[PDB]
Amino acid sequence: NPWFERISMLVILLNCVTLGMFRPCEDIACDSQRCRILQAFDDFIFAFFAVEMVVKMVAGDTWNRLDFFIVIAGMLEYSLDLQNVSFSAVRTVRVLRPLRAINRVPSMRILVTLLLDTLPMLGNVLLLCFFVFFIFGIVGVQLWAGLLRNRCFLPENFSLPLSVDLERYYQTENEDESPFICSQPRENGMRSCRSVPTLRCVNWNQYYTNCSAGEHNPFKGAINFDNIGYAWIAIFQVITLEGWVDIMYFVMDAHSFYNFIYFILLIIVGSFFMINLCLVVIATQFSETKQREIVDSKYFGRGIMIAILVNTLSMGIEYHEQPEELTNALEISNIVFTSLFALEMLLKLLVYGPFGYIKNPYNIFDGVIVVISVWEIVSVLRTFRLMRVLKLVRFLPALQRQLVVLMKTMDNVATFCMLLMLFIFIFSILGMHLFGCKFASLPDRKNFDSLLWAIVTVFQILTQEDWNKVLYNGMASTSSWAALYFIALMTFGNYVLFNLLVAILVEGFQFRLLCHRIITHKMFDHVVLVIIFLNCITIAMERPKIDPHSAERIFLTLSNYIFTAVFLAEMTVKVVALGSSWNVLDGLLVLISVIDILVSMVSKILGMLRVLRLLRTLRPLRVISRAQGLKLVVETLMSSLKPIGNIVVICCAFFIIFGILGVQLFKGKFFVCQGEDTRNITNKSDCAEASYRWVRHKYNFDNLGQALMSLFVLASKDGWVDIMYDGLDAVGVDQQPIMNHNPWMLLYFISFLLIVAFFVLNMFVGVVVENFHYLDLFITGVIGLNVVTMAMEHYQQPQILDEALKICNYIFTVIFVLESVFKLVAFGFRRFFQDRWNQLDLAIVLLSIMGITLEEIEVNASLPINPTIIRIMRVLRIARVLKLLKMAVGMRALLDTVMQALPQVGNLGLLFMLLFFIFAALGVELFGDLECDETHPCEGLGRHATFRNFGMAFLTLFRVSTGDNWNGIMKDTLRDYNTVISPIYFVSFVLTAQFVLVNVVIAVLMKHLEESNK
């Protein structure tokens, strides 16, 4: 009996190794001998399992029912295989064979029972997820159906000659990824057929003037709003915050500029207060589900503590293209330190006994370090000098206690990481059968051929980075119903399975006298806050294209004087009366502002002066002291960081250690030859004959300076895939990179993404745990049928389908009038108004009858009315679905908890806009004069994201704060002093904006976790 449970697990290991080596390209035919042996193995495997179900039928509840479903899906395969005519859709069902392991492994079965016990409480946030997909889905179909099909065409009478080979509409350089999408004369839009570039004789690009709907949508047909099906694929890509910016820029070009409001709202409501609401429910219910269940004279000890850290620091300056006299000085420095720790071993071996030298567990590690290092001194060994950084651990006890508890965690999450590698493997087999050899086929890097590149792709999709690029391949190569793979992969992986890991961690850790009178006065703290807000208007008004001798420059020149005088007079009042840190901050800002007046009165002075203007952008932070809600919160945030100060130290150390490891593997390798054909190019001088350009990559590992930026762009996960591609291709110092040259470098880039995600997740739980200590039933079916009849509207719907939804709109409005008059009978004019929902019900029926009698007038054509009001009325028809709010009694209790903690959120949010203000001001000052034209290309900036003035810098820093292509913006700043400035600007913005947004999530969770206690 007990040997039966372990011998069943050995056959499942034999079934995973059989599914893994599937080889989808060559297994179209069974002619290979390797394919035929595997088939026999599968047949034997099926037989063992089938027999095992009979022996269990000597004596199900849940897991035998999964075990019975798989053998039935097996028998259906061998039944069709006999008579030789079949489809190839039931083969894919054997992906569910590694699911058997969950019952066998006794630690996985207990974990997935707790997962299936908390998912019923997760149904209220999927009820909210329906309102977001339906409200933002129907509006998007009302606005932008068929507007991404339109191009600039020729005129219809215009005959074209037979030989020019022009497409009859303006094709760009990459027609699928970014076509030229114009605005019709009906709409406003941001693009018109006027701005078509001259053709590079006779140019036919001036004749494309007819903006008309074409035949295909961008990204090979996957991004459009013609249906409620395709609208949910676009909205789901906005929820994950990956590529939502390319969707908004299509809509800005074709419909109007003001379409940005729709996008800002969907990220706040959906991508932030709905995705993080799924974390709070799982992290609460999991916590309630389990609770339901002379050499030590300290001068020699301080002598070695500097001797390790000086040795380690020296390694940091590897520096590509060094003098070589520095390398000789580096190797002599190896001889001096390694002889010293040979000497330290020689003293501790003589004064202390060798019976007690091995008895100390730290000493043996040091001893090994000597025999490895000394042996190498008297490559792979020169890389082992980084391991000597681990000798700091004996000399300090605080990270000894932190590295102990951090490894107690890896005992607790070991059963999670086994269930996580079952999840990645099962979706990787499924990707090989569904997609296989059907992509661009040179074939693209993100294929589902060859299981190793199927596991990396599924891991990559899980990290939410260029996953839309994988979606658009699979939708265009099988069918548009292949989006359900990527929705199932990412909802079940990121939104239930990652939040389980947070839930495991959370439960695991647990004159002069009168001058003092006005300072006391309450309105003095308020009247100066108006003067601060009046000064914020004249920071936003600054921009590079103001004339120096104008009516606006003298308003910015003179108002500089009246504010600098009144903040100086505000300070010399307090010094007379009073005689804190926030008073120090206010004095330095006026100290900066007075000197800038004097330096301006004098005229390399400008270079010195330039610095003063940057300092002036910090004027907006004066309000933190004045506002009482902003002062408590900032202090609390600063206070919260102390507990996880040790985890940051280990994490700050780890960036250095993978930083010096990164330089020593990748030093001077990241050079590439940008040219025309570049296929017969092997090295550097080969480009010198072809007159191409031997260009360096923007993110690289030449020194420790460039490496710590390449590791930040990995850790923020934006554009990390392209950096991993550069390390896989890296062949030599002056050598042309070859595609997939060293595939073992996946161990460098994926171990860094996993360890960083472990510290950040342990910094998160450390901050959380310290902060802890039959009428209306008939109206439900009518609304549930109105939801259907609004989603049936689509682009180019027939006249029979169009007229039928008009008659249905006639009978829903009438029986909303009827159910309001009938309910007024039993209540009688007072209880119908004393209720709150009847004031919401009758207001909907009012707006429904308001538009239905006004659309009749246009069909009457008695007055040629504005068709704008017909459309607005149509969009406001979506209001009918709200009447489901009263019914959803469990979802409204979930939103009421958020309201309790809403006050804290408002304070955090207001600090979120001081970050945008200061940064936006800085951006105009730093990045305002640069341009993206046809002469100068840009990877991240363009017609829709500049720093040209304050308003456009406020939207770009919204796009950076979500982390969608923030690094392509950074690559455009250092395209041409921006070598030092542009790293400091973006790292200070991303580390601060994410820390403010995490505290919004921490503040919501504490209001919900404590309500579950009391």
Ligand SMILES: CC(C)CCC[C@@H](C)[C@H]1CC[C@H]2[C@@H]3CC=C4C[C@@H](OC(=O)CCC(=O)O)CC[C@]4(C)[C@H]3CC[C@]12C
């Ligand atoms: C918070 C959620 C649950 C409630 C529903 C939010 C949206 C469905 C509504 C809220 C206000 C609406 C916006 C108000 C301002 C307009 C300007 C309008 O631009 C135009 O000037 C029309 C141009 C033309 O005529 O072609 C385009 C739609 C838009 C963005 C609307 C898009 C849909 C919005 C975002």
Ligand SMILES: CC(C)CCC[C@@H](C)[C@H]1CC[C@H]2[C@@H]3CC=C4C[C@@H](OC(=O)CCC(=O)O)CC[C@]4(C)[C@H]3CC[C@]12C
């Ligand atoms: C763990 C958190 C803090 C993220 C990692 C920190 C880095 C993202 C930040 C910290 C200070 C910054 C660095 C401060 C010093 C400079 C040196 C500077 O040197 C060069 O430009 C040399 C150019 C060449 O190779 O020719 C490059 C930017 C750099 C490395 C900065 C890059 C980004 C840095 C490393």
Ligand SMILES: CC(C)CCC[C@@H](C)[C@H]1CC[C@H]2[C@@H]3CC=C4C[C@@H](OC(=O)CCC(=O)O)CC[C@]4(C)[C@H]3CC[C@]12C
């Ligand atoms: C080691 C830890 C404790 C400090 C954190 C890293 C940075 C804050 C410091 C320490 C090591 C410094 C680097 C040491 C080696 C040099 C090489 C130096 O070489 C050049 O100027 C480029 C010359 C060329 O391109 O040929 C540029 C600055 C740089 C990267 C330094 C930039 C600033 C660094 C990264």
Ligand SMILES: CC(C)(C)NC(=O)CN1CCC(CNC(=O)c2cc(F)cc(Cl)c2)CC1
């Ligand atoms: C900080 C806090 C807690 C508020 N929110 C997050 O941290 C959200 N983040 C986790 C999910 C996404 C990345 N998800 C993975 O990287 C990933 C990779 C895998 F291989 C497996 C899994 Cl389950 C997930 C985005 C970042």
Ligand SMILES: *[C@@H]1O[C@H](CO)[C@@H](O)[C@H](O)[C@H]1NC(C)=O
């Ligand atoms: C624009 O092009 C479409 C199709 O190419 C045509 O039907 C329409 O009449 C054209 N409009 C004008 C004004 O030429």
Ligand SMILES: *[C@@H]1O[C@H](CO)[C@@H](O)[C@H](O)[C@H]1NC(C)=O
């Ligand atoms: C060409 O001429 C008219 C304009 O007079 C244009 O509107 C139409 O599309 C064409 N008509 C015919 C008959 O080709």
Ligand SMILES: *[C@@H]1O[C@H](CO)[C@@H](O)[C@H](O)[C@H]1NC(C)=O
């Ligand atoms: C590249 O090399 C191959 C093999 O020598 C040759 O046939 C081909 O013409 C070369 N291409 C160019 C552009 O020189």
Ligand SMILES: *[C@@H]1O[C@H](CO)[C@@H](O)[C@H](O)[C@H]1NC(C)=O
């Ligand atoms: C560079 O590549 C060419 C291949 O065309 C090779 O012949 C040459 O030896 C290489 N090395 C140099 C020029 O140092």
Ligand SMILES: [Ca+2]
């Ligand atoms: Ca991205």
Ligand SMILES: [Ca+2]
């Ligand atoms: Ca991203």
